Amino acid sequence: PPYTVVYFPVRGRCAALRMLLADQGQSWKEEVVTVETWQEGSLKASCLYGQLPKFQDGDLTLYQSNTILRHLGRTLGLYGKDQQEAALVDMVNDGVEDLRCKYISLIYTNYEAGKDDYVKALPGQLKPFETLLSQNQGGKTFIVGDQISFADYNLLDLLLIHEVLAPGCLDAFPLLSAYVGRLSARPKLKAFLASPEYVNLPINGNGKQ
Amino acid sequence: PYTVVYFPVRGRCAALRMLLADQGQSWKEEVVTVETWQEGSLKASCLYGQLPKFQDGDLTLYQSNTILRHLGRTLGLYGKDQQEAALVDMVNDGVEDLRCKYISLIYTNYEAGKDDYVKALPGQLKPFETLLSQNQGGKTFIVGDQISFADYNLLDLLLIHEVLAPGCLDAFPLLSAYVGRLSARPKLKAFLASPEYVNLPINGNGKQ
Ligand SMILES: COc1cc([C@H](CC(=O)O)SC[C@H](NC(=O)CC[C@H](N)C(=O)O)C(=O)NCC(=O)O)cc(OC)c1OC
Numbered sequence: 288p289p290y291t292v293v294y295f296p297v298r299g300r301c302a303a304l305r306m307l308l309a310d311q312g313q314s315w316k317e318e319v320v321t322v323e324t325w326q327e328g329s330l331k332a333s334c335l336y337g338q339l340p341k342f343q344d345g346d347l348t349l350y351q352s353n354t355i356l357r358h359l360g361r362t363l364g365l366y367g368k369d370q371q372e373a374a375l376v377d378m379v380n381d382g383v384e385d386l387r388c389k390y391i392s393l394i395y396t397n398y399e400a401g402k403d404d405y406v407k408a409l410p411g412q413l414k415p416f417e418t419l420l421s422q423n424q425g426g427k428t429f430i431v432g433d434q435i436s437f438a439d440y441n442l443l444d445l446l447l448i449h450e451v452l453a454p455g456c457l458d459a460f461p462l463l464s465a466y467v468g469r470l471s472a473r474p475k476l477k478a479f480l481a482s483p484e485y486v487n488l489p490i491n492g493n494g495k496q
Numbered sequence: 497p498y499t500v501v502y503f504p505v506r507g508r509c510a511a512l513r514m515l516l517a518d519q520g521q522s523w524k525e526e527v528v529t530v531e532t533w534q535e536g537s538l539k540a541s542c543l544y545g546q547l548p549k550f551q552d553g554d555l556t557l558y559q560s561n562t563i564l565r566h567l568g569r570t571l572g573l574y575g576k577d578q579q580e581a582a583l584v585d586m587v588n589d590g591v592e593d594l595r596c597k598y599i600s601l602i603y604t605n606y607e608a609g610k611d612d613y614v615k616a617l618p619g620q621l622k623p624f625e626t627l628l629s630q631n632q633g634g635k636t637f638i639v640g641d642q643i644s645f646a647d648y649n650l651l652d653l654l655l656i657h658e659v660l661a662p663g664c665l666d667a668f669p670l671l672s673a674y675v676g677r678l679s680a681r682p683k684l685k686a687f688l689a690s691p692e693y694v695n696l697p698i699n700g701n702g703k704q
């Protein structure tokens with residue numbers, strides 16, 4: 288395949304880019320790194336920022352999950368119709384990243400003591416994305432414009448993992464709730480989300496969700 | 497054509513201001529004091545409840561890296577091709593990761609965390625030295641042979657870390673020379689010497 292994903296055996300920060308690749312009908316190789324292999328240290332020392340994912344597109348080696356998303360967005364035409372839309376796509380993705388960082392901090396560093404406060408704060412964190420949908424064709428299409436973007440896949444993943452963390456959290460957000468259902472029903476993505484290579488990976492690496 | 501809406505600090509607008517100044521662009525600063533911000537109405541109107549807010553005509557943007565990428569895209573500071581654009585993103589995302597750690601230290605744990613942060617800092621700066629070493633021996637920019645928005649963000653990151661940990665670039669000859677070279681670009685040099693930069697604090701809590 289032209290693409291290789293090098294990552295731990297979790298969904299994590301590769302979930303969105305995998306959904307993107309699958310929904311776009313692209314082929315890729317998964318190179319699985321166990322935490323054991325990672326402890327040996329040689330792969331880690333060779334990674335630019337000491338972390339995974341690592342991604343290959345031919346001889347182009349990338350690190351940083353959002354760099355991979357933007358690269359696929361640019362090369363597959365999932366980055367808006369013009370410069371204005373591209374900026375709005377970035378604005379969405381940066382918002383998704385901010386909330387993802389808070390989610391990851393909760394999962395890996397403070398789950399038991401922090402979950403109540405996190406869930407309490409969650410509606411205020413989701414509301415900006417509902418607002419964005421409400422300002423774009425009544426929320427009937429995508430997060431920006433009338434074609435899918437890499438930010439849709441990232442936002443979709445963020446919403447899916449938050450439904451596991453806080454079941455019912457989208458009940459207060461009709462546009463986000465319908466958006467999750469609509470994107471999840473896209474045939475190639477629906478098949479991917481139902482497949483063992485997605486279903487049989489945990490969301491995170493520490494057993495919490 | 498441009499308006500920057502922000503608190504009276506360098507913070508997350510420092511890099512985009514350096515970009516605008518170095519590119520000879522004109523912009524308006526709309527300063528929001530913490531007092532005005534406490535009133536709540538501006539905050540409630542911001543997409544993510546935060547500043548900076550940026551206007552380019554009737555395009556209103558939020559998110560500091562969105563502003564950087566928008567200026568990069570529209571001013572030709574985003575690599576020569578898709579391959580370079582991906583490398584520019586890879587740099588900027590690395591800058592953002594370290595900036596988040598810096599901000600966490602400054603605003604949430606300065607006193608107890610500074611020693612460990614400075615201890616860890618060489619390992620956090622080394623990737624950017626490595627990136628320079630793989631691009632024309634470090635003699636030009638962080639990616640390719642023309643400046644990108646990631647250069648301005650990386651430059652700011654390096655400048656604030658020199659204040660936090662003086663001498664932190666002494667181990668890194670390419671980063672050291674790079675800071676000196678970019679800082680000497682005539683429009684940027686003038687901006688960095690000007691009161692609108694010098695007389696703003698780096699952060700909003702008096703720590704640096
Ligand atoms: C905290 O332990 C941990 C973290 C993770 C990560 C979880 C996630 O963010 O979904 S991903 C693995 C991690 N990489 C990054 O944090 C990449 C950040 C970068 N800005 C990007 O966007 O790509 C990583 O490589 N950690 C290893 C290390 O630093 O040595 C996953 C975990 O297990 C799967 C774990 O537990 C080990």
Ligand SMILES: COc1cc([C@H](CC(=O)O)SC[C@H](NC(=O)CC[C@H](N)C(=O)O)C(=O)NCC(=O)O)cc(OC)c1OC
Binds near residue numbers: 546547560700
């Ligand atoms: C912690 O209090 C605080 C923070 C800051 C920020 C410092 C910095 O990151 O350099 S910026 C102001 C902040 N906006 C963001 O964090 C934007 C993040 C976004 N992902 C982006 O990249 O643009 C903000 O608006 N805080 C106010 C709020 O949330 O109500 C500056 C501060 O004062 C100058 C303060 O202290 C108030």
